[PDB]
Amino acid sequence: HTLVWGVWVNGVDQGDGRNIYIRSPPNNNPVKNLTSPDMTCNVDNRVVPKSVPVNAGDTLTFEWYHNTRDDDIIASSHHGPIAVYIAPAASNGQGNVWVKLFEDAYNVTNSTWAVDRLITAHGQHSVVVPHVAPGDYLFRAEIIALHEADSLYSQNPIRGAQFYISCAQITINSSDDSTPLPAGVPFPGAYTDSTPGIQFNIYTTPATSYVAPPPSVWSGALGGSIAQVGDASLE
Ligand SMILES: *[C@@H]1O[C@H](CO)[C@@H](O)[C@H](O)[C@H]1NC(C)=O
Ligand SMILES: [Cl-]
Ligand SMILES: [Cl-]
Ligand SMILES: [Cl-]
Ligand SMILES: [Cl-]
Ligand SMILES: [Cl-]
Ligand SMILES: [Cl-]
Ligand SMILES: [Cl-]
Ligand SMILES: [Cl-]
Ligand SMILES: [Cl-]
Ligand SMILES: [Cl-]
Ligand SMILES: [Cl-]
Ligand SMILES: [Cl-]
Ligand SMILES: [Cl-]
Ligand SMILES: [Cl-]
Ligand SMILES: [Cl-]
Ligand SMILES: [Cu+2]
């Protein structure tokens, strides 16, 4: 159970974005139904009044929280991967539009999942803004908590992989469009019951065996890391 507070750009906090430049849901409940429109941008997908200005090559940091800013972030039980996707705003996230900019699942050296590291990072993870066409975009940050992913929601609706999905409205101003955005996958649609990484038993299967759900990360990506870029508590 986690939500996005806002973003940072190049290490500078852009301010509370909830319902402003984040298409925030009303609470931190997961989405579980892989076929639902809620997979696109969560349960209150509508245009919000602001878009954060960035340029190609900027670092865009999402900052998550649980109940209050810079708290425990997400329950430690919620081991799983993190991804970030991009789509043009004109799509409203519909159709085959989402292109993967970042994936992190399990770090063997550290023996930690992405979520574990997100907690350590005070909720912060980043991507580098790609050289796509200037214009309005949606950046879709997605945390998959696997603690009940031994079951499939479609079979047992009280269990399943839990998706914490947040869409930020981002305007890319300066970019040479030298890596134009390639085809994307749909959400809902890309993840199905048989997709690798959706059904997994984190209690019996070694974490080193985990394969996150495709698509692969786009070659045009620059991204990205799970790491604290700024100290929220100084504000
Ligand atoms: C899952 O989402 C689909 C598509 O919106 C819907 O038809 C179905 O009823 C949902 N399942 C549940 C259990 O709500
Ligand atoms: Cl839970
Ligand atoms: Cl609710
Ligand atoms: Cl739940
Ligand atoms: Cl759901
Ligand atoms: Cl704006
Ligand atoms: Cl808060
Ligand atoms: Cl916990
Ligand atoms: Cl960190
Ligand atoms: Cl550029
Ligand atoms: Cl679907
Ligand atoms: Cl498994
Ligand atoms: Cl993986
Ligand atoms: Cl590619
Ligand atoms: Cl980064
Ligand atoms: Cl700082
Ligand atoms: Cu939760």
Coordinates of N, CA and C and ligand atoms in Angstrom, one line a residue:
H1 N 0.9 -1.2 0.0 CA 0.0 0.0 0.0 C 0.9 1.2 0.0
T2 N 0.9 1.9 -1.1 CA 1.8 3.0 -1.4 C 1.3 3.9 -2.5
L3 N 1.7 5.2 -2.5 CA 1.2 6.2 -3.4 C 2.4 7.1 -3.8
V4 N 2.3 7.9 -4.8 CA 3.3 8.9 -5.2 C 2.9 10.2 -4.6
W5 N 3.9 10.8 -3.9 CA 3.7 12.2 -3.4 C 3.9 13.3 -4.5
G6 N 5.0 13.1 -5.3 CA 5.4 14.0 -6.2 C 6.7 13.5 -6.9
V7 N 7.3 14.4 -7.7 CA 8.5 14.1 -8.3 C 9.6 15.2 -8.1
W8 N 10.8 14.8 -8.3 CA 11.9 15.7 -8.3 C 12.5 15.7 -9.8
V9 N 13.1 16.8 -10.1 CA 13.7 16.9 -11.4 C 15.1 17.4 -11.2
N10 N 16.1 16.6 -11.6 CA 17.5 17.0 -11.4 C 17.8 17.3 -9.9
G11 N 17.2 16.5 -9.1 CA 17.4 16.7 -7.6 C 16.7 17.8 -7.0
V12 N 15.7 18.4 -7.7 CA 15.0 19.5 -7.2 C 13.5 19.1 -7.0
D13 N 13.0 19.2 -5.8 CA 11.6 18.8 -5.6 C 10.7 19.7 -6.3
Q14 N 9.7 19.1 -7.0 CA 8.7 19.8 -7.8 C 7.5 20.2 -7.0
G15 N 7.4 19.7 -5.7 CA 6.3 20.0 -4.9 C 5.3 18.9 -4.9
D16 N 4.4 19.0 -3.9 CA 3.3 18.0 -3.8 C 2.6 18.0 -5.1
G17 N 2.5 16.8 -5.7 CA 1.9 16.6 -7.0 C 0.5 16.0 -7.0
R18 N 0.1 15.6 -5.8 CA -1.1 14.7 -5.7 C -2.3 15.5 -6.2
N19 N -3.0 14.9 -7.2 CA -4.1 15.5 -7.9 C -3.8 16.8 -8.6
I20 N -2.5 17.0 -8.8 CA -2.0 18.3 -9.4 C -1.3 17.9 -10.7
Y21 N -0.2 17.2 -10.6 CA 0.4 16.6 -11.8 C 0.5 15.1 -11.7
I22 N 0.1 14.5 -10.6 CA -0.1 13.0 -10.5 C -1.6 12.7 -10.6
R23 N -2.0 11.7 -11.4 CA -3.4 11.3 -11.5 C -3.7 10.4 -10.3
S24 N -3.7 11.0 -9.1 CA -3.7 10.2 -7.9 C -5.1 9.5 -7.7
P25 N -5.0 8.2 -7.3 CA -6.2 7.6 -6.8 C -6.5 8.1 -5.4
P26 N -7.7 7.7 -4.8 CA -8.1 8.3 -3.5 C -7.4 7.7 -2.3
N27 N -6.8 6.5 -2.5 CA -6.1 5.8 -1.5 C -5.0 4.9 -2.0
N28 N -4.3 4.3 -1.1 CA -3.1 3.4 -1.5 C -3.5 1.9 -1.8
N29 N -4.7 1.6 -2.0 CA -5.1 0.2 -2.3 C -4.5 -0.2 -3.6
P30 N -4.1 -1.5 -3.7 CA -3.6 -2.1 -4.9 C -4.7 -2.2 -6.0
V31 N -4.2 -2.2 -7.2 CA -5.0 -2.8 -8.3 C -4.5 -4.2 -8.5
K32 N -5.5 -5.2 -8.7 CA -5.1 -6.6 -8.9 C -5.7 -7.2 -10.2
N33 N -6.7 -6.6 -10.8 CA -7.4 -7.2 -11.9 C -6.6 -6.8 -13.2
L34 N -5.9 -7.7 -13.8 CA -5.1 -7.5 -14.9 C -5.8 -7.0 -16.1
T35 N -7.1 -7.3 -16.2 CA -7.9 -6.9 -17.4 C -8.6 -5.6 -17.2
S36 N -8.5 -5.0 -16.0 CA -9.2 -3.7 -15.7 C -8.6 -2.5 -16.3
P37 N -9.5 -1.6 -16.7 CA -8.9 -0.2 -17.1 C -8.1 0.4 -16.0
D38 N -8.3 0.0 -14.7 CA -7.5 0.5 -13.7 C -6.0 0.2 -13.8
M39 N -5.7 -0.8 -14.6 CA -4.2 -1.1 -14.9 C -3.5 0.1 -15.6
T40 N -4.3 0.9 -16.3 CA -3.6 2.0 -17.1 C -2.9 3.0 -16.1
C41 N -3.7 3.7 -15.3 CA -3.3 4.7 -14.5 C -4.0 4.7 -13.1
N42 N -4.4 3.5 -12.7 CA -5.1 3.4 -11.4 C -6.6 3.9 -11.5
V43 N -7.2 4.0 -10.4 CA -8.7 4.0 -10.4 C -9.4 5.4 -10.6
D44 N -8.6 6.5 -10.7 CA -9.1 7.8 -11.0 C -8.2 8.4 -12.1
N45 N -8.3 7.8 -13.2 CA -7.6 8.3 -14.4 C -8.3 9.4 -15.1
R46 N -7.8 10.6 -14.9 CA -8.3 11.8 -15.5 C -7.2 12.8 -15.6
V47 N -7.4 13.8 -16.5 CA -6.4 14.9 -16.6 C -6.4 15.7 -15.4
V48 N -5.2 16.0 -14.8 CA -5.0 16.8 -13.7 C -4.4 18.1 -14.2
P49 N -4.5 19.2 -13.4 CA -4.2 20.5 -14.0 C -2.9 20.9 -14.4
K50 N -1.9 20.3 -13.9 CA -0.4 20.6 -14.2 C 0.4 19.4 -14.8
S51 N 1.4 19.8 -15.5 CA 2.4 18.9 -16.1 C 3.8 19.4 -15.8
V52 N 4.6 18.5 -15.4 CA 5.9 18.9 -14.9 C 6.9 19.1 -16.1
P53 N 7.5 20.3 -16.2 CA 8.4 20.5 -17.3 C 9.8 19.9 -17.1
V54 N 10.2 19.1 -18.1 CA 11.5 18.5 -18.1 C 12.1 18.6 -19.5
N55 N 13.4 18.4 -19.6 CA 14.1 18.2 -20.8 C 14.8 16.9 -21.0
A56 N 15.0 16.4 -22.2 CA 15.7 15.2 -22.4 C 17.0 15.2 -21.6
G57 N 17.4 14.1 -21.0 CA 18.6 14.0 -20.2 C 18.5 14.4 -18.8
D58 N 17.3 14.9 -18.4 CA 17.0 15.3 -17.0 C 16.7 13.9 -16.2
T59 N 17.0 14.0 -14.9 CA 16.6 12.9 -14.0 C 15.3 13.2 -13.4
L60 N 14.3 12.3 -13.6 CA 13.0 12.4 -13.1 C 12.8 11.4 -12.0
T61 N 12.6 11.8 -10.7 CA 12.5 11.0 -9.6 C 11.1 10.9 -9.1
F62 N 10.5 9.7 -9.0 CA 9.2 9.5 -8.3 C 9.5 9.3 -6.9
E63 N 8.6 9.9 -6.0 CA 8.7 9.7 -4.6 C 7.5 9.2 -4.0
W64 N 7.6 7.9 -3.5 CA 6.4 7.2 -2.9 C 6.4 7.4 -1.4
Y65 N 5.2 7.1 -0.9 CA 5.0 7.1 0.5 C 3.8 6.2 0.9
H66 N 3.6 5.9 2.2 CA 2.6 4.9 2.6 C 1.4 5.7 3.1
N67 N 1.6 6.4 4.2 CA 0.5 7.2 4.9 C 0.8 8.7 4.9
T68 N 2.1 9.0 5.2 CA 2.6 10.3 5.2 C 3.9 10.4 4.5
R69 N 4.3 11.6 4.0 CA 5.5 11.7 3.3 C 6.7 11.2 4.1
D70 N 7.6 10.4 3.4 CA 8.9 10.0 4.0 C 8.7 9.2 5.2
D71 N 7.7 8.3 5.2 CA 7.4 7.4 6.2 C 8.1 6.1 5.9
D72 N 7.4 4.9 6.3 CA 8.0 3.6 6.0 C 7.8 3.2 4.5
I73 N 7.2 4.1 3.7 CA 7.1 4.0 2.2 C 6.1 2.9 1.7
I74 N 6.4 1.7 2.1 CA 5.6 0.5 1.7 C 6.0 -0.6 2.7
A75 N 5.0 -1.4 3.1 CA 5.3 -2.6 4.0 C 6.4 -3.4 3.5
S76 N 7.3 -3.8 4.3 CA 8.4 -4.6 3.9 C 8.1 -6.0 3.4
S77 N 6.9 -6.4 3.7 CA 6.4 -7.7 3.1 C 6.2 -7.7 1.6
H78 N 6.1 -6.5 1.0 CA 5.6 -6.3 -0.4 C 6.8 -6.4 -1.3
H79 N 7.7 -7.4 -1.1 CA 8.8 -7.7 -2.1 C 8.3 -7.8 -3.5
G80 N 9.0 -7.2 -4.4 CA 8.7 -7.3 -5.8 C 9.5 -6.2 -6.6
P81 N 9.2 -6.2 -7.9 CA 9.9 -5.4 -8.9 C 9.3 -4.0 -9.0
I82 N 10.1 -3.1 -9.7 CA 9.6 -1.8 -10.1 C 9.9 -1.6 -11.5
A83 N 9.0 -0.9 -12.2 CA 9.2 -0.5 -13.6 C 8.6 0.9 -13.8
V84 N 9.1 1.5 -14.8 CA 8.6 2.8 -15.3 C 8.3 2.7 -16.8
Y85 N 7.1 3.1 -17.2 CA 6.8 3.2 -18.6 C 6.5 4.7 -19.0
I86 N 6.5 4.9 -20.3 CA 6.2 6.2 -20.9 C 5.1 6.0 -22.0
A87 N 4.2 7.0 -22.2 CA 3.3 7.0 -23.3 C 3.0 8.5 -23.6
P88 N 2.7 8.8 -24.9 CA 2.3 10.2 -25.2 C 1.0 10.5 -24.5
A89 N 0.7 11.7 -24.1 CA -0.5 12.0 -23.4 C -1.7 11.9 -24.3
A90 N -1.5 12.2 -25.6 CA -2.7 12.1 -26.5 C -3.4 10.8 -26.5
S91 N -2.6 9.7 -26.1 CA -3.2 8.4 -26.0 C -4.2 8.2 -24.8
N92 N -4.0 9.0 -23.8 CA -4.7 8.7 -22.5 C -4.3 7.3 -22.0
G93 N -3.1 6.8 -22.4 CA -2.7 5.5 -22.0 C -3.4 4.3 -22.7
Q94 N -4.2 4.6 -23.7 CA -5.0 3.6 -24.4 C -4.2 3.0 -25.5
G95 N -4.5 1.8 -25.9 CA -3.8 1.2 -27.0 C -2.3 0.8 -26.8
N96 N -1.6 0.5 -27.8 CA -0.3 -0.1 -27.7 C 0.8 0.9 -27.6
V97 N 0.8 1.6 -26.5 CA 1.5 2.8 -26.3 C 2.6 2.9 -25.3
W98 N 2.6 2.0 -24.3 CA 3.5 2.1 -23.1 C 4.8 1.5 -23.5
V99 N 5.9 2.3 -23.3 CA 7.2 1.9 -23.6 C 8.0 1.9 -22.3
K100 N 8.7 0.7 -22.0 CA 9.4 0.6 -20.7 C 10.8 1.3 -20.7
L101 N 10.9 2.2 -19.7 CA 12.1 3.0 -19.5 C 13.0 2.4 -18.4
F102 N 12.5 1.5 -17.5 CA 13.2 1.0 -16.4 C 12.6 -0.2 -15.8
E103 N 13.5 -1.1 -15.4 CA 13.1 -2.3 -14.7 C 14.1 -2.7 -13.7
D104 N 13.6 -3.0 -12.5 CA 14.5 -3.5 -11.4 C 13.7 -4.6 -10.6
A105 N 14.2 -5.8 -10.5 CA 13.5 -6.8 -9.9 C 14.3 -7.3 -8.6
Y106 N 15.3 -8.1 -8.8 CA 16.1 -8.6 -7.7 C 17.6 -8.4 -8.0
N107 N 18.2 -7.9 -7.0 CA 19.7 -7.6 -7.0 C 20.4 -8.7 -6.3
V108 N 21.1 -9.5 -7.0 CA 21.7 -10.7 -6.4 C 22.9 -10.3 -5.5
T109 N 23.7 -9.3 -5.8 CA 24.8 -9.0 -5.0 C 24.4 -8.5 -3.6
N110 N 23.3 -7.8 -3.6 CA 22.7 -7.1 -2.4 C 21.7 -8.0 -1.7
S111 N 21.2 -9.0 -2.4 CA 20.2 -9.9 -2.0 C 18.9 -9.1 -1.6
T112 N 18.6 -8.1 -2.5 CA 17.4 -7.3 -2.2 C 16.5 -7.1 -3.5
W113 N 15.2 -7.1 -3.2 CA 14.3 -6.7 -4.2 C 14.3 -5.2 -4.4
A114 N 13.7 -4.8 -5.6 CA 13.5 -3.4 -5.8 C 12.8 -2.7 -4.7
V115 N 11.7 -3.3 -4.3 CA 10.9 -2.7 -3.2 C 11.7 -2.4 -1.9
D116 N 12.6 -3.4 -1.6 CA 13.4 -3.3 -0.4 C 14.3 -2.1 -0.5
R117 N 14.9 -1.9 -1.7 CA 15.7 -0.8 -2.0 C 15.0 0.6 -2.1
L118 N 13.7 0.5 -2.5 CA 12.9 1.7 -2.5 C 12.6 2.2 -1.1
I119 N 12.4 1.3 -0.2 CA 12.2 1.7 1.2 C 13.5 2.5 1.7
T120 N 14.7 1.9 1.4 CA 16.0 2.4 1.8 C 16.2 3.8 1.2
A121 N 15.6 3.9 0.0 CA 15.8 5.2 -0.8 C 14.7 6.2 -0.4
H122 N 14.0 6.0 0.7 CA 13.0 7.0 1.1 C 11.9 7.2 0.0
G123 N 11.6 6.1 -0.7 CA 10.6 6.1 -1.7 C 11.0 6.6 -3.0
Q124 N 12.3 6.9 -3.2 CA 12.7 7.6 -4.5 C 13.3 6.6 -5.5
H125 N 12.8 6.7 -6.7 CA 13.4 6.0 -7.8 C 13.3 6.9 -9.1
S126 N 14.3 6.8 -10.0 CA 14.4 7.7 -11.0 C 14.6 7.1 -12.4
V127 N 14.3 7.9 -13.4 CA 14.6 7.6 -14.8 C 15.2 8.9 -15.4
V128 N 16.0 8.7 -16.5 CA 16.5 9.7 -17.2 C 15.6 10.0 -18.4
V129 N 15.2 11.2 -18.6 CA 14.2 11.5 -19.7 C 14.8 11.3 -21.0
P130 N 14.1 10.5 -21.9 CA 14.7 10.1 -23.2 C 14.6 11.2 -24.2
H131 N 15.3 11.0 -25.3 CA 15.3 12.0 -26.5 C 14.1 11.8 -27.4
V132 N 13.0 11.8 -26.9 CA 11.7 11.6 -27.7 C 11.2 13.0 -28.1
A133 N 10.1 13.0 -28.9 CA 9.6 14.2 -29.4 C 9.1 15.1 -28.3
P134 N 9.5 16.4 -28.3 CA 8.8 17.3 -27.4 C 7.3 17.2 -27.3
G135 N 6.7 17.3 -26.2 CA 5.3 17.2 -26.0 C 4.9 16.7 -24.7
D136 N 3.6 16.4 -24.5 CA 3.1 15.9 -23.3 C 3.1 14.4 -23.2
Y137 N 3.5 13.9 -22.0 CA 3.6 12.5 -21.8 C 3.0 12.1 -20.4
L138 N 2.7 10.8 -20.4 CA 2.4 10.1 -19.1 C 3.6 9.2 -18.8
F139 N 4.1 9.3 -17.6 CA 5.1 8.4 -17.0 C 4.4 7.6 -16.0
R140 N 4.3 6.3 -16.2 CA 3.6 5.3 -15.4 C 4.6 4.5 -14.6
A141 N 4.7 4.8 -13.3 CA 5.5 4.0 -12.3 C 4.6 2.9 -11.7
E142 N 5.3 1.7 -11.7 CA 4.6 0.5 -11.3 C 5.4 -0.3 -10.3
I143 N 4.9 -0.5 -9.2 CA 5.4 -1.4 -8.2 C 4.5 -2.7 -8.1
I144 N 5.1 -3.9 -8.2 CA 4.4 -5.1 -8.1 C 4.8 -5.8 -6.8
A145 N 3.9 -5.9 -5.9 CA 4.1 -6.6 -4.7 C 3.7 -8.0 -4.8
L146 N 4.6 -8.9 -4.5 CA 4.5 -10.3 -4.8 C 4.1 -11.3 -3.6
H147 N 3.8 -10.7 -2.5 CA 3.6 -11.4 -1.3 C 2.4 -12.4 -1.3
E148 N 1.4 -12.1 -2.2 CA 0.3 -13.0 -2.4 C 0.2 -13.5 -3.9
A149 N 1.3 -13.4 -4.6 CA 1.3 -13.7 -6.0 C 1.5 -15.2 -6.3
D150 N 1.5 -16.0 -5.3 CA 1.4 -17.4 -5.5 C 0.1 -17.8 -6.2
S151 N -1.0 -17.0 -5.9 CA -2.3 -17.2 -6.5 C -2.5 -16.2 -7.7
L152 N -3.4 -16.4 -8.5 CA -3.8 -15.5 -9.6 C -5.1 -14.8 -9.1
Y153 N -5.2 -13.5 -9.2 CA -6.5 -12.8 -8.9 C -7.7 -13.3 -9.7
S154 N -7.4 -13.7 -11.0 CA -8.5 -14.1 -11.8 C -9.1 -15.4 -11.3
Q155 N -8.4 -16.2 -10.5 CA -8.8 -17.4 -9.9 C -9.3 -17.3 -8.5
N156 N -8.6 -16.4 -7.7 CA -8.9 -16.2 -6.3 C -8.7 -14.7 -6.1
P157 N -9.9 -14.0 -6.1 CA -9.8 -12.5 -6.0 C -9.3 -11.9 -4.7
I158 N -9.2 -12.8 -3.7 CA -8.6 -12.3 -2.4 C -7.1 -12.4 -2.4
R159 N -6.5 -12.9 -3.4 CA -5.0 -12.9 -3.5 C -4.6 -12.4 -4.9
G160 N -3.3 -12.6 -5.3 CA -2.8 -12.1 -6.5 C -1.7 -11.1 -6.3
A161 N -0.9 -11.0 -7.3 CA 0.0 -9.9 -7.5 C -0.7 -8.5 -7.2
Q162 N 0.0 -7.6 -6.6 CA -0.6 -6.3 -6.3 C 0.1 -5.2 -7.0
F163 N -0.6 -4.4 -7.8 CA 0.0 -3.4 -8.6 C -0.3 -2.0 -7.9
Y164 N 0.8 -1.3 -7.7 CA 0.7 0.1 -7.2 C 1.2 1.0 -8.4
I165 N 0.2 1.7 -9.0 CA 0.4 2.3 -10.4 C 0.2 3.7 -10.2
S166 N 1.1 4.5 -10.7 CA 0.9 6.0 -10.6 C 1.4 6.6 -11.9
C167 N 0.5 7.5 -12.4 CA 0.8 8.2 -13.6 C 1.0 9.7 -13.4
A168 N 2.2 10.1 -13.8 CA 2.6 11.5 -13.7 C 2.5 12.2 -15.1
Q169 N 2.0 13.4 -15.1 CA 1.9 14.2 -16.4 C 3.2 15.0 -16.4
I170 N 4.0 14.7 -17.5 CA 5.3 15.3 -17.7 C 5.3 15.9 -19.1
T171 N 5.8 17.2 -19.2 CA 6.0 17.8 -20.5 C 7.5 17.9 -20.8
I172 N 7.8 17.3 -21.9 CA 9.2 17.3 -22.4 C 9.3 18.5 -23.3
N173 N 10.2 19.5 -23.0 CA 10.4 20.7 -23.7 C 11.5 20.6 -24.6
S174 N 12.7 20.6 -24.1 CA 13.9 20.5 -25.0 C 14.3 19.0 -25.2
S175 N 14.2 18.6 -26.5 CA 14.7 17.3 -26.9 C 14.8 17.4 -28.4
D176 N 15.9 16.9 -28.9 CA 16.2 16.7 -30.3 C 15.4 15.6 -31.0
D177 N 14.5 14.9 -30.3 CA 13.8 13.8 -30.9 C 14.7 12.9 -31.7
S178 N 15.9 12.6 -31.2 CA 16.8 11.7 -31.9 C 16.5 10.2 -31.6
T179 N 15.7 9.9 -30.6 CA 15.2 8.5 -30.3 C 13.7 8.6 -30.2
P180 N 13.1 8.7 -31.4 CA 11.6 8.8 -31.3 C 11.0 7.5 -30.6
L181 N 9.9 7.7 -30.0 CA 9.3 6.7 -29.2 C 8.8 5.5 -30.1
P182 N 9.2 4.3 -29.8 CA 8.8 3.1 -30.5 C 7.5 2.6 -30.1
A183 N 7.0 1.5 -30.7 CA 5.7 0.9 -30.3 C 5.7 0.6 -28.9
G184 N 4.5 0.7 -28.3 CA 4.4 0.3 -27.0 C 3.4 -0.9 -26.7
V185 N 3.3 -1.3 -25.5 CA 2.3 -2.4 -25.1 C 1.1 -1.7 -24.4
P186 N 0.0 -2.5 -24.3 CA -1.2 -1.9 -23.7 C -1.3 -2.2 -22.2
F187 N -1.8 -1.3 -21.4 CA -2.2 -1.6 -20.1 C -3.6 -1.1 -19.9
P188 N -4.6 -1.9 -19.6 CA -4.5 -3.4 -19.4 C -4.1 -4.1 -20.8
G189 N -3.5 -5.3 -20.7 CA -3.3 -6.2 -21.8 C -2.0 -6.9 -21.8
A190 N -1.0 -6.1 -21.5 CA 0.4 -6.7 -21.5 C 0.7 -7.8 -20.5
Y191 N 0.1 -7.7 -19.3 CA 0.2 -8.7 -18.3 C -1.0 -9.6 -18.4
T192 N -0.8 -10.9 -18.4 CA -1.8 -11.9 -18.4 C -1.4 -12.9 -17.3
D193 N -2.3 -13.9 -17.0 CA -2.0 -14.8 -16.0 C -0.8 -15.7 -16.3
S194 N -0.4 -15.9 -17.6 CA 0.7 -16.7 -17.9 C 2.0 -15.9 -18.1
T195 N 1.9 -14.6 -18.0 CA 3.1 -13.8 -18.2 C 4.1 -14.1 -17.1
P196 N 5.4 -14.2 -17.5 CA 6.4 -14.4 -16.4 C 6.4 -13.3 -15.4
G197 N 6.5 -13.6 -14.2 CA 6.6 -12.6 -13.1 C 5.3 -12.3 -12.4
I198 N 4.2 -12.7 -13.0 CA 2.9 -12.4 -12.4 C 2.4 -13.3 -11.3
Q199 N 2.7 -14.6 -11.6 CA 2.4 -15.7 -10.6 C 3.8 -16.2 -10.2
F200 N 4.1 -16.1 -8.9 CA 5.4 -16.4 -8.4 C 5.3 -16.7 -7.0
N201 N 6.1 -17.6 -6.4 CA 6.1 -17.9 -5.0 C 7.4 -17.5 -4.4
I202 N 7.4 -16.3 -3.7 CA 8.6 -15.7 -3.2 C 9.1 -16.5 -2.0
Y203 N 8.3 -17.4 -1.4 CA 8.7 -18.1 -0.2 C 9.3 -19.4 -0.5
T204 N 9.1 -19.9 -1.7 CA 9.8 -21.2 -2.1 C 10.8 -21.1 -3.3
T205 N 10.6 -20.2 -4.1 CA 11.4 -20.1 -5.3 C 12.5 -19.1 -5.1
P206 N 13.7 -19.4 -5.4 CA 14.7 -18.5 -5.1 C 14.5 -17.2 -5.9
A207 N 14.8 -16.0 -5.3 CA 14.6 -14.7 -5.9 C 15.4 -14.5 -7.1
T208 N 16.6 -15.3 -7.2 CA 17.4 -15.3 -8.3 C 16.8 -15.9 -9.6
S209 N 15.8 -16.7 -9.4 CA 15.0 -17.3 -10.5 C 13.8 -16.4 -11.0
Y210 N 13.5 -15.3 -10.3 CA 12.4 -14.4 -10.7 C 12.8 -13.7 -12.0
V211 N 11.8 -13.7 -12.9 CA 11.9 -13.0 -14.2 C 10.7 -12.0 -14.2
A212 N 11.0 -10.7 -14.3 CA 10.0 -9.7 -14.3 C 9.1 -9.8 -15.5
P213 N 7.9 -9.3 -15.5 CA 7.1 -9.3 -16.7 C 7.7 -8.5 -17.8
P214 N 7.7 -9.1 -19.0 CA 8.0 -8.2 -20.2 C 7.0 -7.1 -20.3
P215 N 7.3 -6.1 -21.2 CA 8.3 -6.0 -22.2 C 9.7 -5.6 -21.6
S216 N 10.7 -5.9 -22.5 CA 12.0 -5.5 -22.1 C 12.1 -3.9 -22.1
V217 N 13.2 -3.5 -21.4 CA 13.4 -2.1 -21.4 C 13.9 -1.6 -22.8
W218 N 13.3 -0.5 -23.3 CA 13.6 0.1 -24.6 C 15.1 0.4 -24.7
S219 N 15.8 0.1 -25.8 CA 17.2 0.5 -26.0 C 17.4 2.0 -25.9
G220 N 16.4 2.8 -26.2 CA 16.4 4.3 -26.2 C 16.4 4.8 -24.8
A221 N 16.0 4.0 -23.8 CA 16.0 4.4 -22.4 C 17.4 4.9 -21.9
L222 N 17.5 5.7 -20.8 CA 18.8 6.2 -20.0 C 18.9 6.0 -18.4
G223 N 17.7 6.2 -17.8 CA 17.3 5.6 -16.6 C 18.4 4.7 -16.1
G224 N 18.6 4.8 -14.8 CA 17.6 5.1 -13.9 C 18.0 4.2 -12.9
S225 N 17.5 4.4 -11.7 CA 18.0 3.9 -10.5 C 16.9 4.0 -9.3
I226 N 17.2 3.2 -8.3 CA 16.4 3.3 -7.1 C 17.4 3.8 -6.0
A227 N 17.2 5.1 -5.6 CA 18.2 5.8 -4.8 C 17.6 7.1 -4.4
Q228 N 17.9 7.5 -3.2 CA 17.5 8.8 -2.7 C 18.3 9.9 -3.4
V229 N 17.6 10.8 -4.1 CA 18.1 12.1 -4.7 C 18.0 13.3 -3.8
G230 N 17.0 13.3 -3.0 CA 16.8 14.6 -2.2 C 16.2 14.2 -0.8
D231 N 16.4 15.1 0.1 CA 16.0 14.9 1.5 C 14.7 15.7 1.7
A232 N 13.6 15.0 1.8 CA 12.3 15.6 2.0 C 12.2 16.3 3.3
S233 N 12.9 15.8 4.3 CA 12.8 16.3 5.7 C 13.4 17.7 5.8
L234 N 14.2 18.2 4.9 CA 14.8 19.6 5.0 C 13.8 20.8 4.7
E235 N 12.7 20.4 4.1 CA 11.6 21.4 3.7 C 10.7 21.8 4.9
Ligands
LIG1 C1 -11.9 -7.5 -13.9 O1 -11.9 -6.4 -14.9 C2 -12.8 -6.8 -16.0 C3 -12.7 -5.7 -17.0 O2 -13.1 -4.4 -16.5 C4 -14.3 -6.9 -15.4 O3 -15.1 -7.3 -16.5 C5 -14.3 -8.0 -14.3 O4 -15.6 -8.0 -13.8 C6 -13.2 -7.7 -13.3 N1 -13.2 -8.7 -12.2 C7 -13.7 -8.5 -11.0 C8 -13.6 -9.6 -10.1 O5 -14.2 -7.3 -10.6
CL2 CL -1.5 -6.7 1.3
CL3 CL -11.6 2.3 -1.9
CL4 CL -5.2 -5.8 -0.5
CL5 CL -8.5 -4.5 -8.8
CL6 CL 1.2 22.8 -16.5
CL7 CL 1.6 13.7 3.4
CL8 CL 5.6 -5.9 6.6
CL9 CL 19.3 5.3 -1.2
CL10 CL 18.2 16.5 -26.7
CL11 CL -6.5 -7.4 -20.8
CL12 CL 7.2 -19.7 -8.6
CL13 CL 14.1 -9.8 -14.2
CL14 CL 14.4 -1.9 -27.7
CL15 CL 18.8 7.7 -12.4
CL16 CL 18.5 17.4 -0.5
CU17 CU -0.1 -3.1 0.6

